[PDB]
Design a binder for this molecule. Sequence first.
Ligand SMILES: *[C@@H]1O[C@H](CO)[C@@H](O[C@H]2O[C@H](CO)[C@@H](O)[C@H](O)[C@H]2NC(C)=O)[C@H](O)[C@H]1NC(C)=O
Ligand code: NAG
Lengths: 145, 186, 128, 413, 49
Amino acid sequence: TMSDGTCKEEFTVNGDPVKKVICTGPNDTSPGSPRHTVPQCCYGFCIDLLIKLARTMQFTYEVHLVADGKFGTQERVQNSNKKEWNGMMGELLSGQADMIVAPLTINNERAQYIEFSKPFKYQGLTILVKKEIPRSTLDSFMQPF
Amino acid sequence: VLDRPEERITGINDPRLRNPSDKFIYATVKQSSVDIYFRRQVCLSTMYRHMEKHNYESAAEAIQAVRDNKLHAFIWDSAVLEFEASQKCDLVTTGELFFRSGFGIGMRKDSPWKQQVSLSILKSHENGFMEDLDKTWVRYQECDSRSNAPATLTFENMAGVFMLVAGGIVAGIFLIFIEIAYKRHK
Amino acid sequence: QSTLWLLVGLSVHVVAVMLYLLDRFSTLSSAMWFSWGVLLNSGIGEGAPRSFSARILGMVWAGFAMIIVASYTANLAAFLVLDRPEERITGINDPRLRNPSDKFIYATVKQSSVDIYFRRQVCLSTMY
Amino acid sequence: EEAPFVIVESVDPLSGTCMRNTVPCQKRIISENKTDEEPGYIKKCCKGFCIDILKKISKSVKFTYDLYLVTNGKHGKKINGTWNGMIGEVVMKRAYMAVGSLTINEERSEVVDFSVPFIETGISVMVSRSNGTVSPSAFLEPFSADVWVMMFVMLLIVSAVAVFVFEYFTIGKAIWLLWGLVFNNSVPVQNPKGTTSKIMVSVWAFFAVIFLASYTANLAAFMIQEEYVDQVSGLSDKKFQRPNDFSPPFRFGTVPNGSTERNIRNNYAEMHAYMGKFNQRGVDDALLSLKTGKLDAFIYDAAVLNYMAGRDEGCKLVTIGSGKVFASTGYGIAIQKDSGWKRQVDLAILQLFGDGEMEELEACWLTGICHNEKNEVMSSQLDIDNMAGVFYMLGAAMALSLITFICEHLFYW
Amino acid sequence: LLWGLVFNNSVPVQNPKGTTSKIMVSVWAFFAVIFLASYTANLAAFMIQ
Ligand SMILES: *[C@@H]1O[C@H](CO)[C@@H](O[C@H]2O[C@H](CO)[C@@H](O)[C@H](O)[C@H]2NC(C)=O)[C@H](O)[C@H]1NC(C)=O
Ligand SMILES: *[C@@H]1O[C@H](CO)[C@@H](O)[C@H](O)[C@H]1NC(C)=O
């Protein structure tokens, strides 16, 4: 945010007003910090969809980022027997939230304990790798010589 | 043609992805869905171990490490990664989609808002709303670049023979000097 | 394509006569012989246009014809690879063996073991 | 019955009941004479994609099941607040579930339930085949412009200094000999001063032949190229939006009273009205009327259109591609409302997605010959635009010659 | 002169009799450049081994 409390607006290529929302959460530094539950400001595809959805359904809300960056998976903690849902999935299933709007995948492991909506963007998995140009000029007069 | 790089990486069938060597590293994000998929897979266990050895904490860190040639290949979602590649730029995706699934809002069981939100999402898919969102600020806002071509001529290619130019010139100056001196002698 | 063929046959003559008239303003036929030869890289030589800049333009057009012959040898080197037959048939995975067309026929011997194998195969029934 | 998702067949002229890996599907013909009655009970047997899906589901959660074809309406639409087709058969309690080619939208979900989608799909546009052209415009790519003029000035300066030191002439001499080195053409070779300068131009020719070998190889490399385009860019394109300009891209197929029909009607009314002249006989008539010239643009469910484009002799095509899919939704398994089966069926289909088994079904139900091998025969000197640009440069050179001759005439006197 | 046509080298070009024979060697050079383009492409092809 800007020092005024909010973060300054802006405009799209068409000069359209980008919606933004105030979202608290992380320590401003996850790796090394005690905690700093500081106010931030969010805006994104999901934020637009949330805005439209709420206007269509008369909500009122407040967004806060997750505590530890992880999406979520099942785990048996140390020094106990109860296997626990990690991360954001846990922040939902414990009682800290009432909904999870994010790029969340769909698979039966999650679908045991949560209810899913219909999909709102289809996709898959794929691999990324760096692209390299370099030519192979080396003693051009000498290599065939 | 001979000096073409090993520019071929396919989806999850290439033997390289199955017999891992420390020349390549394939990483993902810990506690992520991809980790579930790879764990509950029968004959990819070696790959799964070698991957579990080097995973990351967030997507952005892995993107950066690939930009710095520390991580050789990255296996993450398709929409996020496709935008990140086509946009930032001079990064590329290889292979076909395999774990075809979707995204979705989540909720604890039994809230009426589930039954409402599903209908809302369908209605929104009908009005092209999602389509214009995508066209707005998902795609079409990138380093839209074409395919590859063979290498061209550069100055480092010419330097090896430009030396013979100046070398021959200085040799010719000395040679004409000494030849005229000799013709002055005999 | 007879178009890239026929265009030079007129361009050479028109630029040659253009430079010839230029020299006339202050050799015509000799200039024609010269332009044809220098396009063809002939062992037939003659005198250059009188002025400096006319023969300058002549040498520019010469570089142009050089690019022309480079394009020609490149196109032939290309046609080498382009006219390669459909020389690729793999084991039983290629889609062609799965969506049969009357361009190809795959036959075996009746009452043979291969017939058993292909019959008791689930999703090769069309092929069978 | 539909495209590869569900197929029917005569049973078995050899065995009385039909082959392995097939399910017996009954049909009830009621189209005979109206004299007394005949519920036409014929036992045929059906096979295909959705059939395999349900054959695995039933073993996963222990159903049993008959199979029951339908007559009144292809898929289903609202009729005075009543439903025909499969949805009609579901709401009338005659079936818990309907399988096969079935879409998902809002209006159906209002009256029936829906499983989790197991194949994404949507709208798309198929047209006649497309063709390409020449991609490169000028053959300067074999070197950088900086390379080019750097070599240029280096050679010119070295030539001038070699002349100035050999005299210790006739600028045209040096210039023309240099250009003959770079072009390997016949040149009016004057002033062959016999001295070290000859060794100089010998090294010159060394450089020149090396450079020309490099240039020919580089052009041989850069000759590899391809091209393709499609002259439509979405349902929002002016043609569809304004189907009354000079160009009449016409007869959009859109087999009526399916789904894309009602979507179009709810979004683009005038398109519907003008689309009243269309194709009405499934997909085969669509492909035919496209092949003849009876129409040029088809609109239907992408899930079958991409398949049809795949397993097709020759190569027709759809619009630009997957990135052109409008109102993307997915197929489903419509079960009766509020049944307890819904959660288990959903979880089972997700289970199938997990263990990588949809790969097998896509592997041997959904593949095509032409759905691969993207390439083209390279472009020879058929490029009229490239050669025309080069010729325009030549004419500019002619004009420069005219102007410098005028300027020389001015500078003389 | 024929060998210079086939080899594109510098030759002691004598006897340039100015007549139709010049058109003859012009067609000669046409054939020669076509043949040399063919030869270089053919060697580029046969180089694969
Ligand atoms: C679309 O709607 C029409 C409108 O009813 C359906 O059919 C018609 O064709 C039937 C068979 O020939 C007749 O029995 C109906 O009387 C006739 N209706 C009218 C108004 O003429 C048609 O089956 C529906 N589906 C398709 C694919 O066209
Ligand atoms: C409704 O029924 C009337 C006759 O009762 C018929 O003419 C009309 O076409 C029907 N319309 C719909 C939408 O069902």
